[PDB]
Amino acid sequence: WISRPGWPGHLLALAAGALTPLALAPFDYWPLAILSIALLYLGLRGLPGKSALWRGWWYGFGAFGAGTSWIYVSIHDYGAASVPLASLLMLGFTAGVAFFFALPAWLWARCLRRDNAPLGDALAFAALWLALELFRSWFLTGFPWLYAGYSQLQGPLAGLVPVGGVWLSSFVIALSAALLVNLPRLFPHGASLLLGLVLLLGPWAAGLYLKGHAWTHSAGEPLRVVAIQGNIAQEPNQVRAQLDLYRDLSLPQQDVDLIVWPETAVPILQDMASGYLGAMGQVADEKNAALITGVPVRERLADGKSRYFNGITVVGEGAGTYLKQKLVPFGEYVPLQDLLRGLIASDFARGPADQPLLKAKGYQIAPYICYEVVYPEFAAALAAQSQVLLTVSNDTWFGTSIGPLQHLQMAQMRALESGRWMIRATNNGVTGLIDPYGRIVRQIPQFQQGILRGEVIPMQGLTPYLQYRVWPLAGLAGVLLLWALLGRQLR
């Protein structure tokens, strides 16, 4: 009755979708990520296109409702919203984002093969799953949240994360879930049962063997890191209060190499901060350290106009000013403003792709501002030809609940995916250091005014995911989606 249309199967997909947060942020129970995909694969078995779109919608409604439930905290606290209004707004987002799972489930019903399902279909569902995750990361601005692959960060597939990224982890989980469903119709046939076990067990044996493997060389003697966070919340009179606070926590520090300040640590633009940032560079020079801080960067145009960017700059022992490439749709700009800005009755602009890295202490550092970390293909380009990873972010916008913890799990994955140390400096949310294996070595408690002291090692060499990015896996997926497309076309 699970695979037959109507409500009984719809409501199973809700609870199946709702198991996504359990496999991910604090809980990290990875087996539940396999149940979610298996119950959806079995739930879609016999459905026509008319009701298969709604099973996928009811699965995404459960996944994004429970998994992104932190969004309700953002609407309530920082959106000045009452409980019934915030329940409605969160319900409007969840129902819209739930179509990321509705479309592929509908298209699945038109690529789905039950007759040869035992093997061809399990491979085809993994290919369909990788395709919808890749679709999520781009479609409008992208919504790369709740990927199945992040479940295995501390699990047995952590050896495949450096090989294939979060993509390969999600591919194996989707393949393994669909194979279990097809397993009882396998064993009567010895040949297909043996091949099904190599497809099921093969990647998990390879993942455990490759766990903790060092793909990246040691690049030199470690840099001593100092990260400053401060609890600024919704605050121009207090500009001088912030400049004093960040400086006063840096000056007593000694035996330092890197000093890292989170997103918009200096609230004034770097044009008006030239005297302050030069004075902080001299403070950094006598410590023989570099000061890496976020600042808004303004570009004067040829007209009487200005172009504002969300930047990160380095003074003292390092150089370069990086601008944020990809932004948040209604937080940092207005999409289709000539239309939607007349209906909104918001600031920044996009940064260039030809940007260089940030040089500090002679090493290269790949900057990431806010959630640019959640985009796996974009981060891999910066992580390559970079010795150290650094992310400068402001997590107060998410809220007090799960936002930073899910976001931090994605930042650990990028370090595991590149085999690089990451310096995560946040204004309120989790600040810490992450080793090449995705582990959190040092972290200061959130929602407090702390200082973090640590050591990161620059990393040389390269990771198989940084060499061949998702193309080889996405190519295999396109072939697996063709054999399913032509297998139905030929019948």
Residue numbers in the entry: 3 to 237, 242 to 351, 358 to 503
Question: What is written in the article reporting this PDB entry?
Answer:
The rest are acted on by the third and last enzyme in the PTM pathway, apolipoprotein N-acyltransferase, Lnt18. This transferase N-acylates the Cys* of the apo-lipoprotein using preferentially phosphatidylethanolamine (PE) as a lipid substrate and generating the triacylated lipoprotein product218192021. Lnt is a member of the nitrilase family of enzymes with two domains, a membrane domain (MD) and a periplasmic nitrilase-like domain (ND) harbouring the enzyme’s active site. The active site, defined by the catalytic triad, resides in the ND slightly above the membrane surface with an opening for substrates and products that leads into the bulk membrane.
Accordingly, a structure of Lnt from this opportunistic human pathogen (LntPae) was selected for investigation. Because so much was known about Lnt from E. coli (LntEco), it too was included in the study. The LntPae structure and that of an inactive Cys387Ala mutant of LntEco were solved by molecular replacement using the native LntEco structure as the search model. The two structures are remarkably similar with RMSD values over 501 residues of 1.2 Å. Despite having different residues in the active site pocket, the catalytic triad residues superpose almost exactly on one another consistent with the two enzymes catalysing the same N-acyltransferase reaction with similar substrates. The fatty acids of the phospholipids are predominantly 16 and 18 carbons long. To likewise investigate the head group specificity of LntPae, a lipopeptide band shift assay was performed with LntPae, and with DOPE, DOPG or DOPC as acyl donors. Qualitatively therefore, LntPae and LntEco share a similar head group specificity.
